[PDB]
């Protein structure tokens, strides 16, 4: 019913936001299968900055309280062929993220599964009739391997491995 994100420290309820987009990295190399793998961005604050779709919330991996697209999900990249270029996703409908104040945040599983379906449909326009698989972050530093965000003078780190574990046709 919901997807849970373990956070540290514990974000209070007034930190609840609307997910308005995210930023991805396409996995490189030969595929030996008709699939394309996407993970949270392996970049840094510059990939997020060139997205130009954030609002007033400093965050990695997911964009909170930002601006939404006007018609449908829009994906933008410098070079789609370049795996070292991050894929910026701007949603048309926001997805509520609610944190309980006890140390975890929750996202509707039906709403997120609807959102990834729209994203996977948009990536297939750029990469063809291939299976779209999202996987967790490949690794990195805490504030970038986790969905981290600022709220009320404090910086929180939320693991997102439950948001990126699905296969779509």
């Amino acid at each position, epitope marked *: 019913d919901t997807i849970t994100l373990p956070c540290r420290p514990a974000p209070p309820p007034h930190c609840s936001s609307n997910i308005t987009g995210l930023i991805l990295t396409r996995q490189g190399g*030969y595929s030996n299968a008709n699939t394309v793998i996407f993970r949270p961005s392996g970049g*840094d*604050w510059r990939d997020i900055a060139r997205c130009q779709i954030a609002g007033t919330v400093v965050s990695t991996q997911l964009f909170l309280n930002g601006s939404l697209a006007e018609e449908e999900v829009v994906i933008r990249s410098e*070079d789609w062929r*370049d795996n070292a270029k991050s894929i910026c996703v701007q949603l048309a409908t926001s997805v509520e993220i609610a944190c309980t104040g006890a140390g975890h945040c929750a996202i509707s599983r039906a709403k997120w599964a609807n959102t990834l379906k729209q994203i996977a449909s948009k990536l297939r326009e750029q990469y063809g009739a291939k299976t779209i698989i999202f996987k967790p972050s490949s690794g*990195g530093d805490p504030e970038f391997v986790n969905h981290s965000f600022n709220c009320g003078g404090e910086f929180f780190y939320c693991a997102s491995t439950q948001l990126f574990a699905s296969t779509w046709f």
Partner: antibody
Amino acid sequence: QVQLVQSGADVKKPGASVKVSCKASGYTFTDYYMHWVRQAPGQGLEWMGWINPNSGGTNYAQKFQDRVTMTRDTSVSTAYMEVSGLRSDDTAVYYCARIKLCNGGSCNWSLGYWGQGSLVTVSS
Amino acid sequence: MTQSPSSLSASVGDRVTITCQASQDISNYLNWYQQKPGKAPKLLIYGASNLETGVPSRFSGSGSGTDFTFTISSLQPEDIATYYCQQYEFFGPGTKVDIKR
């Protein structure tokens, strides 16, 4: 002035792991991703992945996913590439490389600078 | 990707032509490398037609889209090396150029 100095040759048992280092000098380490490319004896070139030295993020070739770990140490501007579960076909020279800006932006994968390479033999 | 031929021999002063084909329209985002025995590959051409700084004028490259060419206008004995084309993470199999005398 830019150079990449890698670790020496190494021999490892089949099924074990090997960790290769590559120390950078002559430039600001965090301004360029580090690529790793291998070459089996007498064969072509094969990219394994890159690491962002600002954030630690990586992107491996699917062929090496869940088998290779790339990390860095900025204080000594060194990148590391650890390959585990080695098989006989991992015998190769392992290179670190970075790009040189294209002047116009078409060189995000133009490896203008390479290390000397680390020969890793997998045998018993 | 694909490279043609796989190996060729040429005399000093000869014109050498190497062809590399991509599967997708990469515009001009193609690089060419020279690998002499015993050392790291060396970038000669970037952006399909641009020469790396310091490279003699006998090296050049052309092409756009899927079909690209690498050209040594006058072969010198120190140009014996295996030549690779490269687009993004993908390297071609290489063309080995040696000299007949």
